[PDB]
Amino acid sequence: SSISTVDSMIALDIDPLENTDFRVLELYSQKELRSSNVFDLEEIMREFN
Amino acid sequence: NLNCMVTITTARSKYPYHFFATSTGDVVDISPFYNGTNRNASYFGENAD
Ligand SMILES: *[C@@H]1O[C@H](CO)[C@@H](O[C@@H]2O[C@H](CO)[C@@H](O[C@@H]3O[C@H](CO)[C@@H](O)[C@H](O)[C@@H]3O)[C@H](O)[C@H]2NC(C)=O)[C@H](O)[C@H]1NC(C)=O
Ligand SMILES: *[C@@H]1O[C@H](CO)[C@@H](O[C@@H]2O[C@H](CO)[C@@H](O)[C@H](O)[C@H]2NC(C)=O)[C@H](O)[C@H]1NC(C)=O
């Protein structure tokens, strides 16, 4: 018809928590961890050989 | 005084297995699986003669 309708629905729309795909963060690569040492055992053994 | 010996030790190699290393520091640049017909798929860098 042409009659207004009372809007009495108290909206409670709680948006769901969106998914998170946690990264595997890499701070120091293997090369840096191997190069962080002054004395490399492999090089010393190669020199001795 | 001349004495000949036969030492039996254990050698270790890591992937990609392009060199092994006995316990006495004998660093050998030969793949422990190079059988003489798969040089294309296994390293070999020691003296050829
Ligand atoms: C030296 O080692 C190499 C590998 O580094 C050997 O080559 C491989 O030999 C195996 C065993 O014969 C082959 O497998 C065969 O393959 C076919 C399917 O293609 C099948 O008919 C057989 O049942 C068998 O599994 C393999 O293909 C071959 N190549 C590679 C790249 O792995 C070689 O034979 C060794 N040589 C000696 C003298 O021991
Ligand atoms: C020798 O080994 C190399 C790599 O170790 C092989 O080269 C590969 O060849 C395949 C097939 O042609 C390619 O899909 C790869 O991308 C290649 N890899 C590299 C790193 O080049 C070569 O085929 C081998 N030779 C043989 C088996 O005769």
* Cα(A6)–Cα(A33) distance, integer angstroms: 69
Q: Is B40 in the pocket of ligand 2 (CB under 6 A)?
A: yes
Contacts 24+ apart (CB under 8 A), B25-29: B25/A45, B25/A48, B25/A49, B26/A49, B27/A42, B27/A45, B27/A46, B27/A49
Q: Could you give the CA distance from residue B45 to residue B31 in angstroms, rounded to a whole number? A: 9
DSSP class per residue in A1-20: --------------PPPPP-
The answer to whether the CB of B1 is under 6 A from ligand 2 is no
Ligand 1 centroid–CA B37 distance in Å is 10
CA–CA separation, A45 vs B23, rounded Å? Answer: 11
| Experimental technique used to determine this entry | cryo-EM
Query: Please, which residues have CB within 8 angstroms of residue B30's CB and are 6 or more apart in sequence?
Result: B19, B20, B43, B44, B45, B46
Chain A nearest-CA distance from B28, in A, is 9
Residue B30 token pair = 């030969």
Instruction: Give the A-side interface with B, CB within 8 Å.
Output: 42, 45-46, 48-49
Give me the resolution in angstroms, 1 decimal: 3.4
CB B27 within 8 A of CB A46: yes
CA of B26 to the centre of ligand 1 (A): 29
